[PDB]
Amino acid sequence: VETIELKRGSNSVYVQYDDIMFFESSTKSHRLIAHLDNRQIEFYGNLKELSQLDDRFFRCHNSFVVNRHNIESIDSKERIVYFKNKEHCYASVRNVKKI
Amino acid sequence: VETIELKRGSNSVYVQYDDIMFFESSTKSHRLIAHLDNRQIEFYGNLKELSQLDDRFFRCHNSFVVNRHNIESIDSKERIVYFKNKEHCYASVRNVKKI
DNA sequence: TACAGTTAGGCAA
DNA sequence: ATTGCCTAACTGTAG
DNA sequence: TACAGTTAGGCAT
DNA sequence: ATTGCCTAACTGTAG
């Protein structure tokens, strides 16, 4: 229905859009980490294209793409985005305005 | 032989000491993330006790415990610790001296 | 070093 | 099995 | 805003 | 399927 492949070489992981809280960059070259309800998945991708898939995926920071549908709350004073699963990331200066 | 349980509630994950590159803190309360060769595992634990399990686990930062056995290289000028799997973390001011 | 700012994990739910 | 509020202990930076 | 420092992802392997 | 080197675009901070 709303599926995405997270490409991983020797397999792929497939997930639904709204299974994902957010994505962030890994320390491994050209890898991201998809944050799901209570698993994190290492995979090959670019933040840019993922934010261009759907309006709910908002590139809130150079290093983070958040799913609007899974925001639990937002401290826009500290610029922390809270998710349903109690993870959080940060919205940059430039992007917090437009969430 | 050298096994550790990563307690996760509705299951546990068990791993060998040297399967683990390093541990870091999650954004989820009282959870850590174990970094294995190419998976990251969310679990309930404290950095302190893990560094006390074995000398190879060195608490190199408030937020990181590294496995000495899986260090690939160390930039002690930038204070970045590189691991066999091409992840890296940072050694704090206080701890980089003693690795 | 000592200082203004951040956080791991205790305590309660 | 999970979640927040708190503070003792850490963190990076300048003098 | 404009500035000194950091990084996502292109290009090569 | 993986890894490093590079730079255009981001990042936080002070004036």
Give the integer Cα–Cα distance in Å for A69 and A61: 17
How does DSSP classify residue A93?
H
Give the integer Cα–Cα distance in Å for B4 and A31: 27
- Provide the residue ranges of all domains of chain B, joining segments of one domain with +: 1-99
Give the integer Cα–Cα distance in Å for A48 and B84: 28
Alpha-carbon gap: A2 to the closest alpha carbon of chain B (Å): 25
H/E stretch holding B47 reads: helix B47-51
Residue given tokens 């994190």 in the structure block: A40
Opening angle at CA A67, ends A4 and A93, nearest 5:
130
- A contact residues 46-85, partner B, Cβ 8 Å cutoff: 85
Q: Are B51 and B42 in contact (CB under 8 A)?
A: no
Give me the resolution in angstroms, 1 decimal.
3.2
Give the integer Cα–Cα distance in Å for B20 and B57: 10
CATH topology of domain A1-99: OB fold (Dihydrolipoamide Acetyltransferase, E2P) (2.40.50)
Phi, psi dihedrals of residue B9, rounded to the nearest 5°: 80, -85
Q: Which two tokens stand for residue B42?
A: 């969310």
The partner residues of A12 in beta bridges, in order of sequence, read A7
CA at A44, C1' at E12: how many angstroms apart?
18
CA-based Rg of chain B, rounded to a whole angstrom? 13
Give the integer Cα–Cα distance in Å for A85 and A14: 19
Interface contact B89, partner A, CB < 8 A: yes
Cross-chain CB nearest to B39 (options A42, A85, A88): A42
Alpha-carbon gap: B90 to the closest alpha carbon of chain A (Å): 11
Q: Which two tokens stand for residue A84?
A: 């349903």
How does DSSP classify residue A19?
G
Reduced to 3 states (helix: H, G, I; strand: E, B; else coil), residue B62 is coil
How does DSSP classify residue B84?
T
CA at B89, C1' at E3: how many angstroms apart?
28
Q: Which residue from B minimizes the CA distance to A29? A: B86
- Sequence-distant (6+) residues with CB within 8 A of B9 are B44
